[PDB]
Design a protein around this ligand. Sequence first.
Ligand SMILES: Cc1cc(CCCCCCCOc2ccc(C3=NCCO3)cc2)on1
Ligand SMILES: Cc1cc(CCCCCCCOc2ccc(C3=NCCO3)cc2)on1
Ligand SMILES: *C(=O)CCCCCCCCCCCCC
Ligand SMILES: *C(=O)CCCCCCCCCCCCC
Lengths: 62, 62, 116, 266, 266, 135, 279, 279, 4, 4
Amino acid sequence: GAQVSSQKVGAHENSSTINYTTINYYKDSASNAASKQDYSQDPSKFTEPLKDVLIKTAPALN
Amino acid sequence: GAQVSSQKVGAHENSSTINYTTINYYKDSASNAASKQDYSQDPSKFTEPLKDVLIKTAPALN
Amino acid sequence: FCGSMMATGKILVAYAPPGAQPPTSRKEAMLGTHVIWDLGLQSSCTMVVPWISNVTYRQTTQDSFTEGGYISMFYQTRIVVPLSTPKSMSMLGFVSACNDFSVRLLRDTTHISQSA
Amino acid sequence: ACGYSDRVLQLTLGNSTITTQEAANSVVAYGRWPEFIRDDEANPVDQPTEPDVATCRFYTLDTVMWGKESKGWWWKLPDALRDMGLFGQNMYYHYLGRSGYTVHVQCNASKFHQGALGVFAIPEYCLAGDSDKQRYTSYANANPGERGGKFYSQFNKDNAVTSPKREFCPVDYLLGCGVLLGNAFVYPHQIINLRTNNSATIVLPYVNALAIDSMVKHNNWGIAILPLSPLDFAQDSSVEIPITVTIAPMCSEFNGLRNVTAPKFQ
Amino acid sequence: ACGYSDRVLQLTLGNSTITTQEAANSVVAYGRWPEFIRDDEANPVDQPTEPDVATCRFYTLDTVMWGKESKGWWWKLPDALRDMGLFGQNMYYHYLGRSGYTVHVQCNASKFHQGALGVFAIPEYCLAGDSDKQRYTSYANANPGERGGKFYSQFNKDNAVTSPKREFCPVDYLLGCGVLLGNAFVYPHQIINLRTNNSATIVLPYVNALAIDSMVKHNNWGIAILPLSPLDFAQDSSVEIPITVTIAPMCSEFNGLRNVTAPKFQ
Amino acid sequence: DKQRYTSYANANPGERGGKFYSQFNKDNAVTSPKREFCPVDYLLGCGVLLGNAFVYPHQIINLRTNNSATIVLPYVNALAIDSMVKHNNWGIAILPLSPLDFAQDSSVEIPITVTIAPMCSEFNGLRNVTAPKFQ
Amino acid sequence: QDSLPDTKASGPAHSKEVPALTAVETGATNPLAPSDTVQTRHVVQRRSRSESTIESFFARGACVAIIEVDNEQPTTRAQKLFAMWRITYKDTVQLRRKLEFFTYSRFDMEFTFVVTANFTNANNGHALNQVYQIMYIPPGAPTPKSWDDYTWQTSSNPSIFYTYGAAPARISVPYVGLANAYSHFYDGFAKVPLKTDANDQIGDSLYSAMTVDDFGVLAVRVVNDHNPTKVTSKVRIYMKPKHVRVWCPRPPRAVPYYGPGVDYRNNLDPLSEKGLTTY
Amino acid sequence: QDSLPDTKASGPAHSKEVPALTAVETGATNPLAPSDTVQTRHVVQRRSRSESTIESFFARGACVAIIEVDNEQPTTRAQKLFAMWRITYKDTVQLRRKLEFFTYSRFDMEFTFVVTANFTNANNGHALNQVYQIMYIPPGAPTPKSWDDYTWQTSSNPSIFYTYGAAPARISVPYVGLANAYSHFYDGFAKVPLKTDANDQIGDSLYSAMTVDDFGVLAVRVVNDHNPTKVTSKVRIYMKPKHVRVWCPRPPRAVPYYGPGVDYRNNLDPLSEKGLTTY
Amino acid sequence: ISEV
Amino acid sequence: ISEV
Ligand SMILES: Cc1cc(CCCCCCCOc2ccc(C3=NCCO3)cc2)on1
Ligand SMILES: Cc1cc(CCCCCCCOc2ccc(C3=NCCO3)cc2)on1
Ligand SMILES: *C(=O)CCCCCCCCCCCCC
Ligand SMILES: *C(=O)CCCCCCCCCCCCC
């Protein structure tokens, strides 16, 4: 049941893709550490909540 | 001899099916932790111990 | 209904979801969830209290934020008996959970204790 | 199969259930179940309101007592329900409203009691009045609401020409309207004969010369309950048993929304 | 088809037949019919005795009277049957015995009588005692035989420390054992509500932590009958009707034959 | 000085709404307390700065640009449904980001009219009517 | 998938089927759902009974005993240099009541030991870290008379040597009953009085008691020789049933426990006062 | 790949497209890049928002409480032989403000316990190592009146037995809210005053408070019997949200917190003095 | 291994 | 195993 993923390597030693391994030991998912591989989204629901979203090169008001 | 099962995930991180791993270390099953994957049954032997079990839309007494 | 077989009567039993004035009159109780029970050969009547709540789970303790509402009972007509019959009788009540019922967060009960 | 019967019924509408272990089958008036206004019979063009479970449910009216001198009781619909929860509100906020009804009359007694109630559903139940004055019964008096009205064994003419009561004077054997009661059976009806049944159940369609009308101005159906055979028990000269009327609006729809109608009932 | 009913039953075991025209269906405890010990659950190696028709038949116990002050009656099994014909003999000549039971409780009255009996089948019905002394109820007092015992409305502590009665003190609303009676319905049961039924019928499996045990040392089932609603009739303050308990052993088998056990019941 | 003490009647002005204030006047009368809100404008009436209220759904009525503002609100809650009598889901706050002015008349006054429509309204738990005490 | 049943969309009814009416005299509970008596919508149900499974209900370490043992200079009057506890879930009330919702049970048992100590007297110097011995003595085995006699050699009895300060000691035990399931209730006796008996003491037993020693005892001692100053210690025993199975439900204990049997003495008034027509 | 967008090479413009002009009255923020108003080169962007992800922003154990508990001789006046804490992120300000950037939240919660102790008085001899019990008591469960009464038997409540000197205790908790998300803000009441009410106390509630006990309490005690000399201890509780999700952003708290609600009292002047045309 |  |  081991889980294997690539690390995003910052400073590289003078030695390519490096991995790490994770194994959940407990039944309850609450017991689990954080995966920290978190996806992102559009600010649009906050930055542009408009019914008619307009293109930036055209007049905001028309 | 490792045992691998899915966890019923409650609160999900912003990252699908997650597993956990179990290995018994001892010969005596008494030494074992609880699997907690427990099946359920009908209350009927307690709620309806009748020789002639009747359908709820029909008269209980007839 | 544990009365004599010669006894008749119609009863209204009701459930009012929380938030308003607790019913003092059949007139008010009629307006909520209710069953009009007619006494007869089928001795017993069942009123189901449907899960109607705001929160997904209520507390087992008393709390206005997770309150369940009000149950009440009234005479729809009245108990009518013939002569040479008892004019007064007992009613017994029973409660149980419908199959959609569940509980969570295990805890120790206030219903048992022990002194030093 | 299994054990089913004409005598044992369950009615469920909205959050309300009625049971009866002693019914005499049930009646659908004129063989027509209640229905909504069809697109090809429609007349107000505006989108209707259909409140459904909040108005189409069982409202129980104030209980009346049946005794040896009881001559009969009457109600008008929708008037009996004008103050019943959200049905009443919908009725008064709109110019137009149509509704069908399940009427359930309740009267139990005992194997040793005696008596028979004629329960009648009358389309356009126009009633006769007080006076020398024709068509003079006032709106407030024509509409008693939940309380209903009563019948009388004979015609007592309201004599006080100076301050007239402007009331109905419904005489029992004349069905309160100039005809003979014996013929009221051509109307949708049931009989509560106490040796036979606890209750009466009549399902009423919307009946009118129009697809929809003003519920505040006009009653569609009249409910008349008369003792076809008088109440009696053992030898006790002063017997008294309750009669409870429970009514449910059915397929209710409303048109013409605006500010609320507040009728003057004084 | 034909005309059959939940209310009309015939039970036949051995040379004995019970009829009832007013039953409330019948109960099989825990959904398990009585059965014999299987080869793969067997523990005593010696060939069992199965007397069949001579022991598995209906023994009727002494009738008790139900009156307005009656608080409840109880019996233990196999103890109630220890002196019943060849069942009793088989029970006492053997070290081991197992048996299931059909219990039939009988109480008829009239359409004008009133009252309700809670009939309960309890596995391991341990009862509470007399004293400050714990677990002190004597064998002779714990086992009344056919005669059974009774409940009380309250706890009267046996005070005489010098010569103690060593009896149970079963309080009714506590089911005689420290719990509330309202919850005794989690046990296999039936109710004799006199407007509904004459009798109660419960079929009991052999219930134990072992496939077989000593019937003389240990009771498997307790029968508790309590008036859930008190007896009443017309206006007569001193009404009294009979309650008759008839019990049949079922699938009875016995192991460990030797000389007869003669318990001291004095 | 009393925390979480605003009374139901005062928390709920109905159609009439409430107002903001330029500063915090503490209700001093400990014997008969008003149990009212004291909404300070630059703090959005709630302990934060008004300049940041733009992270909320909003529009601006700048009079040289527009007559009106139109915001469509979804039902927002930690539950699919709740008690409307006990709990408000949304608050509408209107503040003058730039003060009204006209020609040189020091006492100018123009109307603000709020028109609101409920949308996709559904109701559960029918019974007798709730009559809150608003006095 | 362990979720409860979805609620079905249910409409109006005008029929000869009457689910609201029934007869509880039969012994059965009416199988009704809200859709049988009220108009219901469709709900897709996600709730689950996961936490009320028999295992989950008992999956918690309960305090069943407090054993006190001293380490001090062996004098000649009664002392606690070693102690013995009869293994039982009954010196405590909480777990006892949970187990008593059922007549019979079968399970493996986990024992966890929390050991605490302190100085008794203001000061005679101090003490070095103590090692505790917890010896199981099954019925039949020799019981110690002295804190350091031959029985403590423990050649065949199981023993734990606990070092103070280490994580709490933990062991597991099999289902060790003489029957096919543990009897939480025994309506009967271990002896029968016979008419032919000499005294009538011979056939006298305790009602509802089975074997005299049930599961034997735990003998606790401090293995260290005594310091000048006295150290008192307490061993708290936590018991957890695991791999649990139960049979025949019972009403919960409603009044206070009065010893090992179903006996009650007082506070037989569990219920409060409440007016019939008072919400 | 989680890097931000590359900057595009952008040249001179002479056009009817005017990205620099807009109207903030609309409610929207102008989506502009440097290439829309200035000549830009091509940059291959390697920077990333990895550390500002909701999880990464809260992935840190915050101090939410300091529980003080004593172990000394049980006298008869008010003492700290056991203590109780209402579970909340609100006795502390730091994590509270981070959580309050959002209206609603959903997460699992990690509790870490750092336990420290010291001697109170100059000297009455010393103490042996202490074991601490941390019992969770969910709303409804019996609360202790005494440091060693029956509630501490903890048969169904979860409890930690911490040994002093061991690494800090750590447990995880599920999303335990009654709603589908935790409400960091509740504009409303738990009770409504009705015209038909007897007193007008009956319908009075605290504004913005929901359930009376919210998540229950933690009861802390020293399991050891008391030494001659007194030992005082403090349990510091560290709280970390994990597997976090959040809804509806809010302005951060700009003035000092005044209790559990949005109430302010003073220091309502967050901003400094700076001249309009002063850099 | 055993994957369930 | 599960390689992502
Ligand atoms: C009655 C009843 C009793 C029970 C629980 C039975 C549990 C029986 C366990 C018997 C053995 O217990 C032991 C406890 C501790 C040790 C031990 N060995 C080394 C030190 O601790 C060994 C056995 O359920 N119903
Ligand atoms: C308001 C609000 C509150 C929150 C945080 C909620 C966290 C709720 C956790 C409830 C349970 O907390 C426990 C803490 C400790 C223990 C514990 N068990 C053994 C000893 O410690 C158990 C539960 O977010 N919003
Ligand atoms: C999938 O996990 C199969 C491979 C397991 C490799 C050995 C893992 C050793 C750690 C097991 C931990 C068990 C914890 C309960
Ligand atoms: C099945 O278990 C084969 C795979 C084992 C993987 C390595 C396990 C490491 C732990 C072994 C524990 C031994 C305990 C006695």
